[PDB]
Enzyme design. Structure first.
Site, PDB file in Angstrom:
ATOM      1  N   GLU A   1       0.837  -1.192   0.000  1.00 58.93           N
ATOM      2  CA  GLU A   1       0.000   0.000   0.000  1.00 58.93           C
ATOM      3  C   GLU A   1       0.884   1.259   0.000  1.00 58.93           C
ATOM      4  O   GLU A   1       1.838   1.344   0.775  1.00 58.93           O
ATOM      5  CB  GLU A   1      -0.929  -0.027   1.224  1.00 58.93           C
ATOM      6  CG  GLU A   1      -1.741   1.238   1.473  1.00 58.93           C
ATOM      7  CD  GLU A   1      -2.499   1.181   2.795  1.00 58.93           C
ATOM      8  OE1 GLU A   1      -2.395   0.158   3.510  1.00 58.93           O
ATOM      9  OE2 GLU A   1      -3.196   2.166   3.119  1.00 58.93           O
TER      10      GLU A   1
ATOM     11  N   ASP B   1       9.746  -3.042  16.360  1.00 58.92           N
ATOM     12  CA  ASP B   1      10.560  -2.039  15.659  1.00 58.92           C
ATOM     13  C   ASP B   1       9.744  -0.777  15.399  1.00 58.92           C
ATOM     14  O   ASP B   1       9.787  -0.192  14.319  1.00 58.92           O
ATOM     15  CB  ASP B   1      11.109  -2.612  14.345  1.00 58.92           C
ATOM     16  CG  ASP B   1      12.313  -1.829  13.806  1.00 58.92           C
ATOM     17  OD1 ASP B   1      12.964  -1.095  14.581  1.00 58.92           O
ATOM     18  OD2 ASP B   1      12.614  -1.971  12.600  1.00 58.92           O
TER      19      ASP B   1
HETATM   20  N1  LIG Z   1       4.278   2.141   1.557  1.00 61.15           N
HETATM   21  C1  LIG Z   1       5.153   3.175   1.601  1.00 61.15           C
HETATM   22  N2  LIG Z   1       4.791   4.413   1.190  1.00 61.15           N
HETATM   23  C2  LIG Z   1       5.646   5.456   1.235  1.00 61.15           C
HETATM   24  N3  LIG Z   1       6.914   5.359   1.677  1.00 61.15           N
HETATM   25  C3  LIG Z   1       7.405   4.176   2.116  1.00 61.15           C
HETATM   26  C4  LIG Z   1       6.536   2.989   2.105  1.00 61.15           C
HETATM   27  N4  LIG Z   1       7.267   1.968   2.590  1.00 61.15           N
HETATM   28  C5  LIG Z   1       8.498   2.454   2.878  1.00 61.15           C
HETATM   29  N5  LIG Z   1       8.579   3.773   2.596  1.00 61.15           N
HETATM   30  C6  LIG Z   1       9.763   4.637   2.787  1.00 61.15           C
HETATM   31  O1  LIG Z   1      10.923   3.817   2.628  1.00 61.15           O
HETATM   32  C7  LIG Z   1      11.590   3.655   3.887  1.00 61.15           C
HETATM   33  C8  LIG Z   1      12.039   2.212   4.084  1.00 61.15           C
HETATM   34  O2  LIG Z   1      10.906   1.343   4.178  1.00 61.15           O
HETATM   35  P1  LIG Z   1      10.951   0.076   5.174  1.00 61.15           P
HETATM   36  O3  LIG Z   1       9.861  -0.868   4.717  1.00 61.15           O
HETATM   37  O4  LIG Z   1      10.944   0.603   6.589  1.00 61.15           O
HETATM   38  O5  LIG Z   1      12.415  -0.509   4.825  1.00 61.15           O
HETATM   39  P2  LIG Z   1      13.444  -1.192   5.876  1.00 61.15           P
HETATM   40  O6  LIG Z   1      12.897  -2.573   6.133  1.00 61.15           O
HETATM   41  O7  LIG Z   1      14.727  -1.208   5.097  1.00 61.15           O
HETATM   42  O8  LIG Z   1      13.477  -0.286   7.085  1.00 61.15           O
HETATM   43  C9  LIG Z   1      10.596   4.097   4.949  1.00 61.15           C
HETATM   44  O9  LIG Z   1      11.243   4.636   6.105  1.00 61.15           O
HETATM   45  C10 LIG Z   1       9.767   5.134   4.218  1.00 61.15           C
HETATM   46  O10 LIG Z   1      10.468   6.378   4.244  1.00 61.15           O
END
Ligand SMILES: Nc1ncnc2c1ncn2[C@@H]1O[C@H](COP(=O)(O)OP(=O)(O)O)[C@@H](O)[C@H]1O
Ligand SMILES: O=C1CCC(c2cccs2)=NN1
Ligand SMILES: [Mg+2]
Ligand SMILES: [Mg+2]
Length: 265
Positions: A85, A130
């Site tokens: 999403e 987390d």
């Molecule tokens: N669904 C999303 N919509 C918008 N930005 C996102 C989304 N998922 C991740 N991001 C951006 O990318 C970054 C890394 O996503 P994340 O799933 O937390 O990766 P990791 O597992 O490496 O921490 C997030 O901190 C956010 O800034």
């Protein structure tokens, strides 16, 4: 099923340790979503294949308005792709850099949406582990959504993979490698509530070693501007002894929360 060819790729939404997250549109439906890219080599070097399966299994099956949806996944010899999403208003992290501190209304409202989503998770004895600003995303009406389930599990548990980066949001039992349960998320809730109001987390120090000392001994002070009711809720969540931390219903019906939050339980 799906493959890279099915998607037009746009600008980078953000970067994480493994994840590189892109804006994307699926070609025949014109559906907009976020594509999280993981490099197989990196996953393997670090040996966190198990965390990835956990992320996909747990998140795909949860359904709650304050939890980010995971729709599917595919892979391609060098990479793994999670289909997420899209959250159009970005991270709580970014919003905190922009404004420095949140006011009491904004803070309590965020804490309510969190507590609602976490209550739902804990009801399937899923613990997230987390919870921090860069994993809290914002929907088109500004509503908070919990994301990044890479570290999540079922309780009770032990930790056996290394904690790479920051200690700032983890309770004493977790940094000491002891065993933990649900109550870890309640500690992180107290850490967030403080950071929302003050602009920095309560155990922040200049070194790993010093931060570790400050968490195990629960050493924090409030600035003068933090009101009595906020001090009360934050002192309750940051108990060394997990059992002394409140239940989530006690967070949602705390007076400060009820007076200030603009959404319900
Ligand atoms: N669904 C999303 N919509 C918008 N930005 C996102 C989304 N998922 C991740 N991001 C951006 O990318 C970054 C890394 O996503 P994340 O799933 O937390 O990766 P990791 O597992 O490496 O921490 C997030 O901190 C956010 O800034
Ligand atoms: O409810 C759903 C499930 C899957 C989905 C997808 C968009 C693009 C690829 S798969 N969008 N919405
Ligand atoms: Mg993350
Ligand atoms: Mg991750």
């Amino acid at each position: 099923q799906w493959a890279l060819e099915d998607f037009e790729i746009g600008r980078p939404l953000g970067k994480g340790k493994f994840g590189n997250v892109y804006l994307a549109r699926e070609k025949q439906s014109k559906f907009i979503l976020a594509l999280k890219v993981l490099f197989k080599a990196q996953l393997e070097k670090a040996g966190v294949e198990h965390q990835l399966r956990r992320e996909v299994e747990i998140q795909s099956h949860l359904r709650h308005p304050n939890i980010l949806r995971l729709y599917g996944y595919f892979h391609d010899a060098t990479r793994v792709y999670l289909i997420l999403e899209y959250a159009p208003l970005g991270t709580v992290y970014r919003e905190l850099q922009k404004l420095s501190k949140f006011d009491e209304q904004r803070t309590a409202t965020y804490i309510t949406e969190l507590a609602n989503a976490l209550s739902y998770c804990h009801s399937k004895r899923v613990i997230h582990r987390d919870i921090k600003p860069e994993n809290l995303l914002l929907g088109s009406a500004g509503e908070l959504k919990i994301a990044d389930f890479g570290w999540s599990v079922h309780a009770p548990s032990s930790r056996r993979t290394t904690l790479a980066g920051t200690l700032d949001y983890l309770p004493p039992e977790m940094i000491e490698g002891r065993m933990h349960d649900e109550k870890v998320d309640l500690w992180s809730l107290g850490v967030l509530c403080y950071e929302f109001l003050v602009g920095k987390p309560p155990f922040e120090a200049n070194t790993y070693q010093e931060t570790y000392k400050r968490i195990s001994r629960v050493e924090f002070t409030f600035p003068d501007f933090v009101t009595e009711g906020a001090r009360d809720l934050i002192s309750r969540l940051l108990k060394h002894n997990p059992s002394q931390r409140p239940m989530l219903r006690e967070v949602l019906e705390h007076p400060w929360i009820t007076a200030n939050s603009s959404k319900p339980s």
